From Swiss-Prot, chain A:
Its main location: cytoplasm. Keywords: Acetylation, Cytoplasm, Isopeptide bond, Phosphoprotein, Ribonucleoprotein, Ribosomal protein, Ubl conjugation. There is a cross-link at residues 16, 174 (Glycyl lysine isopeptide (Lys-Gly) (interchain with G-Cter in ubiquitin)). This is Small ribosomal subunit protein uS7. One of its GO terms (molecular function) is structural constituent of ribosome. It holds the Pfam family Ribosomal_S7. GO terms for cellular component: 90S preribosome; cytoplasm; cytosol; cytosolic small ribosomal subunit; ribosome.
Swiss-Prot record, chain E:
Pfam families: Ribosomal_S28e. This is Small ribosomal subunit protein eS28A. N-terminally acetylated by acetyltransferase NatB. Belongs to the eukaryotic ribosomal protein eS28 family. Present with 94500 molecules/cell in log phase SD medium. There are 2 genes for eS28 in yeast. GO terms for biological process: maturation of SSU-rRNA; positive regulation of nuclear-transcribed mRNA catabolic process, deadenylation-dependent decay; ribosomal small subunit assembly; ribosomal subunit export from nucleus; translation. It comes from Saccharomyces cerevisiae (strain ATCC 204508 / S288c).
UniProtKB/Swiss-Prot annotation, chain H:
The keyword Ribosomal protein applies. Belongs to the universal ribosomal protein uS13 family. Component of the small ribosomal subunit (SSU). Mature yeast ribosomes consist of a small (40S) and a large (60S) subunit. The 40S small subunit contains 1 molecule of ribosomal RNA (18S rRNA) and 33 different proteins (encoded by 57 genes). The large 60S subunit contains 3 rRNA molecules (25S, 5.8S and 5S rRNA) and 46 different proteins (encoded by 81 genes). It is found in: Cytoplasm. This is Small ribosomal subunit protein uS13A. The chain holds residues 11 to 87 of 146 of the full protein. The lineage of its organism: Eukaryota, Fungi, Dikarya, Ascomycota, Saccharomycotina. Coiled coil: none annotated. The gene is RPS18A. It comes from the Eukaryota. GO terms for molecular function: rRNA binding; structural constituent of ribosome.
UniProtKB/Swiss-Prot annotation, chain I:
Component of the ribosome, a large ribonucleoprotein complex responsible for the synthesis of proteins in the cell. The small ribosomal subunit (SSU) binds messenger RNAs (mRNAs) and translates the encoded message by selecting cognate aminoacyl-transfer RNA (tRNA) molecules. The large subunit (LSU) contains the ribosomal catalytic site termed the peptidyl transferase center (PTC), which catalyzes the formation of peptide bonds, thereby polymerizing the amino acids delivered by tRNAs into a polypeptide chain. The gene is RPS25A. Belongs to the eukaryotic ribosomal protein eS25 family. Its main location: cytoplasm. This is Small ribosomal subunit protein eS25A. It comes from the Eukaryota. The chain holds residues 36 to 102 of 108 of the full protein. GO terms for molecular function: structural constituent of ribosome. One of its GO terms (cellular component) is cytosolic small ribosomal subunit. Keywords: Cytoplasm, Methylation, Ribonucleoprotein, Ribosomal protein. It comes from Saccharomyces cerevisiae (strain ATCC 204508 / S288c). One of its GO terms (biological process) is cytoplasmic translation.
Amino acid sequence: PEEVQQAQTEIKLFNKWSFEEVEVKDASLVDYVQVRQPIFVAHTAGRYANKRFRKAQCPIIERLTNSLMMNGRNNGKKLKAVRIIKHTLDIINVLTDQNPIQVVVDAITNTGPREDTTRVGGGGAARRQAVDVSPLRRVNQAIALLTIGAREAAFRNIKTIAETLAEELINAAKGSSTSYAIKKKDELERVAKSNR
Amino acid sequence: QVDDEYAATSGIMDPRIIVTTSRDPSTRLSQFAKEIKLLFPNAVRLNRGNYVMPNLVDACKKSGTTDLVVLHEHRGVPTSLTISHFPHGPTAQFSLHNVVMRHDIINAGNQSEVNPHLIFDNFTTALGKRVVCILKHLFNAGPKKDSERVITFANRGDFISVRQHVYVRTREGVEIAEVGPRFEMRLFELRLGTLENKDADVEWQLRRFIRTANKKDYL
Amino acid sequence: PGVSVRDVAAQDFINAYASFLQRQGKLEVPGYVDIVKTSSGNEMPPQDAEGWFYKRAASVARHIYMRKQVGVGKLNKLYGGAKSRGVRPYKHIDASGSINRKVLQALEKIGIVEISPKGGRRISENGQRDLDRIAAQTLEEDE
Amino acid sequence: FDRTAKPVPVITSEVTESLEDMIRRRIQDSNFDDLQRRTL
Amino acid sequence: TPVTLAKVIKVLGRTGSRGGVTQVRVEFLEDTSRTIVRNVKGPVRENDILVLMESEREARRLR
Amino acid sequence: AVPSVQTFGKKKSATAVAHVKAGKGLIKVNGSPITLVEPEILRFKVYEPLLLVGLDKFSNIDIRVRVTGGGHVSQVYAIRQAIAKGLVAYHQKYVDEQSKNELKKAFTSYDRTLLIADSRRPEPK
Amino acid sequence: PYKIFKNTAFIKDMFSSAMEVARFEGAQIKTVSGIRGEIKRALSKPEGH
Amino acid sequence: FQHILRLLNTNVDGNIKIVYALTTIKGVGRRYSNLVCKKADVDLHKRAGELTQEELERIVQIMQNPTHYKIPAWFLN
Amino acid sequence: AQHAVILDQEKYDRILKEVPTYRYVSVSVLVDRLKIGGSLARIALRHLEKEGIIKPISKHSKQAIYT
RNA sequence: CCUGCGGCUUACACGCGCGCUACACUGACGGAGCCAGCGAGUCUAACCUUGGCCGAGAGGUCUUGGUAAUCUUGUGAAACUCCGUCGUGCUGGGGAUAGAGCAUUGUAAUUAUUGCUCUUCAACGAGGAAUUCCUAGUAAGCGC
């Protein structure tokens, strides 16, 4: 068909958003976020969970696609997550028509809590010790916080999951702390610097 | 007596174990599988999820394993057990009845999982010999001179019962503490073919609707 | 270059064949559709219960074009699902037998249903011609 | 009426105590059963 | 408050501490002279990159 | 005889076998069009078989496929593997083997799992 | 009997309650034709079956 | 649009569609409501702000005279 | 009724003032208490005449129509 | 709500535990599409079956296929996918709870044995102290 000829030259993301010209804003995420893979759909179910750093081999978009089916009511549903991801990407490209990939990457870069904190047992005296956060660890924490805020949005609201996800992604791209993930990153930095 | 299932490997190599379950265990059945894991030395386990048993056992066999135990249950509590000795060895299929749970009663110390001391009590008939050799070749070869972990098999009234006891050689005698589960174990078949066959040579089946099996032990 | 119902879509050709039957008009639908739910495992009645029988007949014609022959057991299990039996586990049930037998009689009226080899359901020259006409009408659905 | 097989035998403090004292012997005299290690 | 960047030179070993957090030597990515041990909690490796919110803070043995 | 090949594609439990002959650029799977993905969201990965080498690269080859077993999601992956295998096979006997090696390298670097078989199979612990 | 598996049967009309059967789990029933057997467990929702 | 009103000594709202407002009464369920809406020749998707008292008394009489209008004996409560 | 467009004329005026501009989606067309007595979520059903404001977003369906 | 060890009673106010169902828009109902494997099945008996039939359904009609890859059987399975309906409402989520009718046995269902249908529409607004299991085709969810 016509879109078959269109995608025959440029392998866009589902032939609706270009899978090129994606940029990572924040530093310390190069080789921690997979954005160099030209693919068609985020369901490449090859064996990547076996190793530690092979989890960075899957795309962060495919990581969020796995994060959609993270609930008792939906653990193991694939095409529901894929269609919801396509709807959320269309909602992002409607709210911000630059690129769903670029806007999502900007939100991921702006939703990162740069510091961490640990509770040390101390032999019976727990204390708050500020510690660093690893690159893939920070990326996974941001993705998890975003998916959790999106899931917590659709508790008493007729809004679609794609709609709440796009609203949280817009709040994270703005960094306005109007989403749970951005509020969580701000509170995490505040707590880490509270006991630095 | 050592058998063709054990003659080339009885005291030669010390064994490893694999503990698993039939399909979708209940939580307490998993906990009991944990107990039978931590009782045995050389203890490694693996959950069975959506696995074809010829594929599972065949894949476990090239990786190298001496024996495989797998369980059953009835609405939370376990009832059955089988042992499959890998190198074409005999599968044995038992009914297990009672249990005490280390989680349930108290934390009474530790299952130190040292190469334990072995006790097989009151086995006379050649079937008792088969059970003794098959079960002995699952424990570790080489406990020490004073290995304080005494495992105990008792064969009174066709219901072999197992406990674990830990002893210290106190002033006038040993003193023991009760650990591990306590059992009412009873077999009902022996097949020299491994369970992957489903049709091979059954050594032994318990006659059930035979009159005299009210009285008689060992068929 | 060859026009097939298999090339045509599910919802698109389903609506097209249902409208063509509605354009045909005569199908002799049962009177039970005013009260039936088309299955025992169904809970509410069909929303377009007048065109539900038409959609079922269109799907049956599509199956008869795809497969050689089918039966009322095959149609019922094909058009069958689970049940709202309460809280106990729901197995899959079949569809209504009398509705299936009436629909089998309903498609031989238009000549779409014929007795297959060793009995069963097949298509005729009139049924194949009507299917080809509906498919060619749906072949021009690309505008 | 009659019985057809022998199911689960109930244990008590006495049966456990009997097996208890016999194993108190059976390590008190330090007789012990084991796999034996073949050379060559 | 611009948090600098740091490339880990190597994961510092024998850092006895609570399981989950480890001291690792990182030289700052802003300048390859500023190098210090830092307490990283996430799953990390060597020759990676990270954000350091403190300039001259250095990790110690946390028992 | 005709210039043709028969190739297979497997899944978790789904198989797919396609006979690819010298044709006109058609792919009939159980007598149905190749642009008829049942989910219809799993189409870009499905049409990636015709996208990894271009839409006109197989304009002289006809495909007759049959997929069975497994699941419906598995059937698509099996059909994709069968299509990749048929494209590689017709590139070797019905076309030049150097072009077969080049297309194999391109499809491999795109996604080796289309041609290679990377099952979710276990390993001992 | 009223329902028959292979090597397992379901029994009506001998008893009328549940604890009747529960008094007898382990009795022996012999077929009139002549094969041995026993009873094993009680069905609850059927009253004596 | 109409709010709740007195119907068979109940207060029934009309802003909701014709199935479920015709269900809240003792002796009528989902299927009975659906089939009496089928038999009273009213559109199944209408909310009862419309359907003036002509059709309301028509469904009153189809309640008190159901077997006149093909309500079968196997459908009875 | 008493007009058969009750709470759907002044609300329709507000929608033509606002919804024909930004626009909203099928989920955000429930704003301004779009509820019973009219069309709560059926604004996309009546959006055949109005077009050229924003693409839609269908949850149960899947569509994006520039309306 | 079923159910495994503990109180008390008969010729019912209870202590320790295992499961399923739900507590709703990734939802719920109407129609469309659909991908399995495991085996099982009847000779002097009636099993497993195909179809046509009628009855909403439940259920009754004769027949071949099969003593077995042949006929079930491609068990056209369920979750799954599309649109339709609906708006967070303890409603259409939810059916514990009853009554009535229908088949359907069986000598009888009577102690709702079972199955359909109608009607009845509880709690359940995410569950504290604690709490187990778990590192990939894994937890998890679905069916034959």
